[PDB]
Amino acid sequence: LAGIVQQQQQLLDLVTRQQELLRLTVWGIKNLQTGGWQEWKRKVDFLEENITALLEEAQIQQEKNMYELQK
Amino acid sequence: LAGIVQQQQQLLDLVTRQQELLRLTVWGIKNLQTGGWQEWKRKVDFLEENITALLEEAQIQQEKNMYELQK
Amino acid sequence: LAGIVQQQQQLLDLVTRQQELLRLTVWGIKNLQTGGWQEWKRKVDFLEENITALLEEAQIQQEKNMYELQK
């Protein structure tokens, strides 16, 4: 199971890095933009906040899984 | 294994949410755009369709894993 | 554990496909862009390189996990 848990850490790191890149693409689009943009912004803001929260929760679950593994 | 299966659900939720954000960034780029854009669109369309299909398959696999766990 | 390992492959495939889509959105933004863009580019380049490396590492870990499973 150590390999499976390690793979989950690698996937978590990948999703975290992809979120960093997504944040940059959103910044880029907002910078180029300055219709339906008002609502676009509201949705993007919700997703960014929600994903950030989910990453934190996934990190906590990773730690619990590692704890149960190490114990 | 319950924690590992739960972590897979959290990663699936993260990728799903990131796809929602990606769909919005693609919408934003298309809106700003209106060269090599014709082919860019074809590739983006393929990826969006393929990822959507993969998310469905991952959800089904998650359910099967949860079933085997619960049983 | 076969189902869990298979689910990790599905998540890896999802993240890989999302990276392909992210690469396209970055290309699109760069094409539309032509301030803080110089640094934006430096950060995006770092993330693209780092994520590519992480995908390779995740693929290797997937293979090791599958090996231990098959053996």
Q: Which of C36, C46, A18 is nearest to B21 (CA)?
A: A18
Taking each helix axis from N to C terminus, what angle separates C37-70 and C2-33, rounded to the nearest 10 degrees? Answer: 160
If one counts every other C-beta atom within 10 angstroms of the C-beta of residue A55, the result is: 17
C32 in reach of chain B (CB within 8 A): yes
- Residues of C with Cβ-Cβ distance to B32 under 8 angstroms: 32
Question: For this experimental structure, what is the resolution in angstroms?
Answer: 1.7
Say which residue the tokens 């975290």 belong to.
A16
Contact C21, B65 (CB under 8 A): no
Q: What is the DSSP string of B1-55?
A: -HHHHHHHHHHHHHHHHHHHHHHHHHHHHHHHH---HHHHHHHHHHHHHHHHHHH
Provide the token pair at B45: 């369309």
* Residue span of the structural domain in which C10 resides: 1-71
- Choose the closest CB to B65 out of C7, C18, C27: C7
Per-residue burial over A5-19, b = 16 or more CB atoms within 10 Å of its CB, e = otherwise:
bbbbbbbbbbbbbbb
Q: Look up tokens 């298309």; give the residue.
A: B30
Method: X-ray
Which residues does chain C have within 8 Å of residue B11's beta carbon, measured at their own beta carbons?
A: 11
Angle at B2 between CA A69 and CA B6, to 5 degrees: 105
A interface test, pick of B4, B29, B47 with most A CB neighbours within 10 Å: B4
Identity of the amino acid at C14: L
Contact B24, A43 (CB under 8 A): yes
Does A29 reach chain B within 8 Å, measured CB to CB?
yes
Question: Domain count of chain B?
Answer: 1
Question: Which sign does the torsion angle of CA A66, A67, A70, B1 carry?
Answer: negative
Helix, coil or strand: residue C71: coil
The CA distances from residue A25 to A15, A32, C67, in Å, are 15, 11, 38
Here the tokens at position C34 are 């032509």
C-alpha span between C53 and A14 (Å, rounded): 10
Structure tokens at C33: 């862009």
Angle of CA points A65, C69, C51, to nearest 5°:
60
The CATH code of the domain that includes B25 is 1.10.287.210
As a whole number of Å, the end-to-end CA separation of chain C is: 13
Burial of B29 (0-12, 13-18, 19+ CB in 10 A): buried
